[PDB]
DNA sequence: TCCATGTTTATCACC
């Protein structure tokens, strides 16, 4: 009768994602003006295609595959989604068209229309942007080629950035319990993010989860505002950790465990008895996932 | 028969709403000042009567004639032929009453108004269905043409009545990006809606190239929100009719601009001028609640939008524009400033930084001296007339121990450590001969120069002007 | 009554009826409050179908309230261009009528854009029960809410009022919505809102009494 | 089926990759920001190149090199001679037009994109540089000879730094097709990346 | 309910 939520948190490497929308001769990413400062976003979108693909990945059938058209993307290979079981892994059986289902009495199902599972925000960096540039030079294809060479070579400029990405999960709904298996399999793919954004084969970045901490109440999402971190030095403590500390009694600490595995560091004993009698366990996010997926599906 | 209409500005959702109220009022106007006008009243008694004008509501009565002539005059189109540069030749509407007050050289201002309206709001080809129709007729042979009439009269009969939108007026009500879902409307508020372009300010915006090329691309339309109807009527007339007639190549000067909110700010700029001018008229406020912006482009067979905007027109900002004509005419890179100052946005101006992405783009192509030499010095902060007299100090003494193309000597010299200097985005050694060569100023030395900041790139600025 | 606060980190008001570019606005809907009251009672909504349009609501029977709205800091915006999800608006064909599997098949991008913070202290004039439920809800067995609690007497904060045709307004919202159903109907009439900025409590103009 | 991936490093020596692009007078390299320091940096390009070329050296079948004859940079033997049938490292190139072999369509039926199997990432340093270390000097003219005529006498200086550097990389496992001899020559080749440089 | 089309203009203000 609880929906437990989750914070992920990612190890520095350069940036490959590139936001399109291209000005002169450089690839521009989006930017907020959080403090009047420049950040990187990561749409929820090419996160939920990642999170799909791995499902299609693992063996999970599916009912919907965006493949490689030679005149421009699309997504096909679906059919009729009358079964949620098979089909839109419990997930957004979106549908529009009012000649469906021969006029939904055959179906004699819901239609899926706005069925929302795992909600999902999306990432934030944690560095500013100073404007970098690496060169770029493309080459013309041929000089004799029947293929077209562009009519000229022209160089142009990139710019990248080392950077980790902060992220809240929102997991929610009590109403997840018809296929546990599915709920695991979708846990451990998380556990297993790798090529989250499709931004290109070189210079690739990847998702590695590390210190993934949060739990709450069977209550709405509140207390910690999954965000108001440093830039990697130390970044659970001055958010929560202080809080959780003078609120010892006050916030519950048995159902909140610790935070970030950064404690099989520093500090360790400390951390393991003064703060509370909890699950604090941290070897390994996948264990971490299976057992708190075990509990979840417990009650 | 009589027809009878009747409307207010306090329930319309649109400011091209109120727009088009003000248009059709100047279509009028300006049909009761035209001779064949009351020839065609007293042949075929035409009835065309404007029976309220106050500051909220107003009336209208007219019968089929009338409408016919509204027709006709607003919807009069012509036949213009144009070379490549195998003949081609365009039809581009009359314009209606932009005709009656463009005395402008060439009526400049027009063919811009011309090629937008054909252009966007025209896109689709019902505008040339019923342009190209209506083209070359004459007015004084008694011309006219009923067909499209009669069903719009048919259907202003049922004003209460609804029926659907189109791509011809604001976009939107078509496909509505999720569900297949119509709009509402009732149809005397889409007649309305036939005369709001005319009211539009147009302005041409580009984007600058490495070789500086002013290349144009798409338009600015600019469109008021009307508060007083009964005075927004009477300022226009002069207010369009006092344009700048500066002309440069294919464009007015003023037809330029680099950034939407430009053409935005320029129109409150004129409005006040003629406020000074014409009489019974006090604040801007009163005349003008909001201004929108939008910025358009048609590509293909499809319309692209960039940006819209409506934001608070307000009075301060009237020593903007003579703030930037005496600063960036001479450079092209100081409209970054402008764009600065349009809770912690009140006095931002007085940092401006505008060194980020200003020099980044300058590096390569715009790089072929001390024009912006003192430029990048506040930038490196984030004082200066003690560091002039120690460098001229220096060389003085050095001519002096030793006792007309040196301004292309000085140019490259510089050059050489400006360059090196943008990069560290030894320093502590040619100013160490310069002090040498040389007191409350001289203590502040100790303190304004040992930031890191200030040792990487502030201190090594000033002492270049010298050699 | 009694009001309170809340704040969330990102945001997005897609003012309906926007066609290809997407805008916004710097203070949520009426209807859009509306809803997440309702959505924060646990009270489900009246209408149970499905089909080509979803928000058949009758007026017939509905929980009576008045609602005000505040804000304390200005926020500014972003735009994102990523991809939007079409929908046909020409004859087109091909591979469209050949699955049709809620299709929506044709896909080009063109712009949005979204909030940078958001913090409000919003005020409510509601019967005892529906305040009891919504205690029950909260205390009880996409990005838009981050966390709720009521504080409010103190932080104290501008508010909003309709406008009368006299002087000017000042950093005012384009558009406002009361109540409105997706089929043929009237909307709303009143559109214009403009902010006060003062300490102590709105004035009795600035509380509106929804007819929902 | 066995994914893996590594990453390696080399022996500390003066750096090699010189862009050279910042004005007459100086030769810069590229850098980046890392944690208020700057760093050396070397682009996949490079590296993708080299391998490239030892795929040429191994006597290897091949459907792309360079001609260096002609007046600025050009690739000749990757779209000339080849129908894209099978590329080095089944990367199956790919450009876009009007037409392209008749859409390669009817002749030969694979995806107008591309493959790219292979996986790489950023080379970047371990210790910072401090500013410029070396100098320099250009002759004046061909003399007596009228052939150069540069008519320069310049004088200028370079950039160099001592740094080891080390890179990641990565491979799929489940990629099967014409492995066996294919991929295993180009790991084997991994160990040498000896001409990855700009001079 | 379902059949249809279109573009044509080059360039300028500082010490």
Same mark, same amino acid.
């Not at chain 2, 035209?34 to 007219?62: C, M, T």
């Not at chain 2, 300022?235 to 935005?264: C, H, M, T, Y």
């Not at chain 3, 509601?126 to 009891?132: G, T, Y």
């Given at each position: ?66 493949? +490689? ?32 289902? &021969?006029? /939904? ?46 009519? !000229? ?65 069977? *209550?709405?999402? %509140? ?71 075990? !509990?979840?599906?417990?009650? | ?15 091209? +709403? ?24 007293? /042949? ?49 509407? =009359?314009? $209606? ?99 709001? &372009? ?11 190239? *490495? ?61 006040? =001028? ?5 009489? @019974? ?13 939008? +910025? ?9 939008? +960039? ?50 992405? $200003? ?10 001296? #001390?024009? !912006? ?50 990069? %560290? ?7 160490? #001969? ?23 790139? !502030? ?9 | 009554?009694? #009001? ?37 009672? @646990? ?7 499905? @089909? ?37 608006? @020409? ?55 981050? /966390? ?56 009795a103009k600035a509380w509106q009494q929804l007819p929902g």
């Amino acid at each position: 009768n609880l929906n437990l939520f989750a914070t992920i948190l990612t190890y520095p490497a350069p940036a490959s994602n590139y936001r399109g929308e291209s000005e002169e001769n450089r690839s521009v990413i989006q930017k907020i003006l959080k403090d009047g400062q420049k950040y990187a976003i990561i749409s929820p979108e090419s996160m939920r295609n990642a999170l799909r693909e791995m499902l299609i990945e693992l063996g999970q059938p599916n009912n919907r595959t965006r493949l +490689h058209s030679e005149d421009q993307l699309a997504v096909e290979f679906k059919e009729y989604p009358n079964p949620d079981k098979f089909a839109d892994d419990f997930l957004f059986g979106y549908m529009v068209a009012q000649t469906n289902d &021969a006029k /939904e009495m055959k179906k004699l199902n819901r239609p899926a229309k706005r069925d929302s599972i795992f909600r999902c925000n999306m990432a934030v960096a944690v560095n500013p942007y100073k404007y970098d540039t690496v060169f770029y030079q493309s080459p013309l294809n041929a000089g004799d080629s029947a293929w077209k060479n562009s009519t !000229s070579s022209a160089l142009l400029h990139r710019e990248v950035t080392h950077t980790a990405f902060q992220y809240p999960f929102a997991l929610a709904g009590k109403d997840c319990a018809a296929k546990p298996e599915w709920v695991k399999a979708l846990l451990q793919a998380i556990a297993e993010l790798n090529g989250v954004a499709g931004g290109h084969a070189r210079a690739y970045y990847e998702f590695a989860p590390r210190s993934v901490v949060a739990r709450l109440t069977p *209550k709405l999402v %509140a207390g910690y505002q999954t965000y108001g971190f440093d830039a990697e030095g130390n970044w659970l403590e001055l958010s929560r950790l202080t809080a959780t500390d003078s609120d010892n009694l006050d916030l519950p600490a048995n159902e909140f465990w610790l935070g970030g595995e950064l404690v099989r560091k520093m500090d360790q004993e400390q951390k393991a008895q003064l703060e509370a009698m909890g699950a604090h366990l941290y070897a390994n996010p996948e264990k971490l996932f299976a057992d708190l997926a075990d !509990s979840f599906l417990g009650v | 028969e009589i027809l009878t209409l009747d409307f207010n500005l306090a329930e319309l959702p649109s400011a091209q +709403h109120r727009a088009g109220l003000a248009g059709l009022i100047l279509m009028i106007r300006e049909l009761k000042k035209w001779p064949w006008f009351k020839i065609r009243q007293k /042949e075929k008694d035409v009835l065309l009567s404007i029976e309220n004008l106050d500051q909220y509501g107003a009336s209208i009565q007219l019968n089929l004639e009338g409408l016919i002539a509204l027709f006709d005059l607003a919807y009069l189109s012509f036949t213009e032929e144009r070379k490549s540069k195998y003949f081609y030749d365009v039809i581009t509407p =009359q314009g $209606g009453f932009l005709a009656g007050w463009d005395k402008s050289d060439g009526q400049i201002w027009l063919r811009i108004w011309r090629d937008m309206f054909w252009s966007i709001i025209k896109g689709v080809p019902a505008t040339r269905n019923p342009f190209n129709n209506r083209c070359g007729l004459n007015l004084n042979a008694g011309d006219s043409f009923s067909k499209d009439v009669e069903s719009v009269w048919k259907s202003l009969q049922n004003a209460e009545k609804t029926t659907g939108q189109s791509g011809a007026f604001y976009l939107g009500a078509m496909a509505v990006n999720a569900e297949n879902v119509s709009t509402d409307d009732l149809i005397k508020w889409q007649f309305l809606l036939h005369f709001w &372009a005319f009211v539009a300010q147009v302005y041409c915006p580009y984007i600058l190239d *490495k070789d500086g090329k002013r290349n144009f691309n798409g338009y600015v339309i600019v469109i008021p929100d009307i508060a007083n109807l009964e005075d927004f009527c009477d300022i226009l007339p002069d207010v369009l009719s006092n344009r700048n007639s500066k002309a440069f190549g294919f464009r007015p000067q003023e037809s330029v601009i680099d950034v939407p909110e430009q053409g935005a700010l320029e129109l409150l700029n004129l409005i006040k =001028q003629r406020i000074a001018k014409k009489a @019974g008229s006090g604040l801007l406020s009163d005349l003008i609640v909001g201004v929108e912006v939008i +910025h358009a482009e048609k590509q293909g067979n499809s319309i692209k939008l +960039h940006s819209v905007s409506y934001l608070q027109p307000n009075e301060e900002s009237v020593d903007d524009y003579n703030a930037i004509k005496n600063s960036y005419y001479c450079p092209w890179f100081r409209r970054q400033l402008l764009l600065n100052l349009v809770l912690a946005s009140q006095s931002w101006l007085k940092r401006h930084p505008w060194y980020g992405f $200003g020099d980044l783009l300058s590096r390569i192509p715009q790089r072929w001296s #001390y024009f !912006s030499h003192d430029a990048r010095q506040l930038f490196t902060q984030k004082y200066a007339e003690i560091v002039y007299k120690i460098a001229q100090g220096f060389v003085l003494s050095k001519l002096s121990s030793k006792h007309p193309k040196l301004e292309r000597e000085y140019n490259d010299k510089k050059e050489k450590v400006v360059n090196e200097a943008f990069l %560290a985005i030894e320093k502590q050694a040619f100013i160490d #001969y310069f002090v040498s060569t040389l007191q409350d100023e001289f203590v502040d030395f100790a303190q304004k120069l040992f930031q890191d900041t200030d040792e990487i790139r !502030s201190l090594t600025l000033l002492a270049l002007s010298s050699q | 009554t009694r #009001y309170l606060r809340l704040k969330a980190p990102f945001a997005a008001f897609r003012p309906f009826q926007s066609g290809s570019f997407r805008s916004t606005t710097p203070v949520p809907s009426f209807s859009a409050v509306y809803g997440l009251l309702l959505n924060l009672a @646990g009270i489900e909504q009246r209408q149970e179908v499905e @089909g080509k349009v979803t928000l058949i609501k009758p007026k017939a029977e509905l929980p009576k309230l008045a609602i005000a709205i505040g804000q304390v800091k200005p926020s500014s915006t972003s735009l994102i261009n990523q991809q939007l999800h079409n929908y046909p608006v @020409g004859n087109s064909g091909k591979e469209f009528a050949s699955r049709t599997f809620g299709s929506k098949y044709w896909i080009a991008p063109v712009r949005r854009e979204v909030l940078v913070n958001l913090d409000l202290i919003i005020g409510l004039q509601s019967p005892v029960e529906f305040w009891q439920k919504l205690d029950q809800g909260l205390k009880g067995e996409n990005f838009l809410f981050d /966390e709720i609690y009521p504080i409010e007497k103190p932080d104290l904060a501008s508010w909003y009022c309709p406008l009368e045709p006299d002087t000017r307004p000042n950093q005012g919202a384009c558009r406002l919505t009361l109540w409105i159903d997706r089929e043929n109907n009237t909307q709303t009439t009143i559109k214009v809102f403009s902010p006060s900025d003062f300490r102590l409590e709105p004035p009795a103009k600035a509380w509106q009494q929804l007819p929902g």
